[PDB]
């Protein structure tokens, strides 16, 4: 995941406006969306 923007777009596809949120969940995961929704779900880390 480079810049995580394709990943942003992965959520921007679903209608997620929380880019500020997502980018951080992305940084936390390393560049995964499916894992990001879990980081987001927990709100910090598993």
d(CA 18, CA 31): 16
Structural determination approach: NMR
Q: How far is CA 17 from the centre of its chain?
A: 11
Q: How far is CA 8 from the centre of its chain?
A: 6
Q: Are 45 and 39 in contact (CB under 8 A)?
A: yes
Q: Tokens 């969940």 appear where?
A: 25
Exposed/middle/buried for residue 19 (C-beta within 10 Å: 0-12, 13-18, 19+): middle
Query: What is the third-level CATH fold of 1-46?
Result: Helicase, Ruva Protein; domain 3 (1.10.8)
d(CA 23, CA 27): 6
d(CA 35, CA 25): 8
Residues 6+ apart with CB under 8 A from 26: 1, 4, 7, 8, 32, 33, 36
DSSP state letter for 15: T
d(CA 46, CA 8): 21
């Amino acid at each position: 995941g480079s810049q995580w923007q394709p990943q942003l777009q992965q959520l921007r596809d679903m209608g997620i406006q929380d880019d500020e949120l997502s980018l951080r969940a992305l940084q936390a995961t390393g560049g995964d969306i499916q894992a990001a929704l879990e980081l987001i779900f927990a709100g910090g880390a598993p």
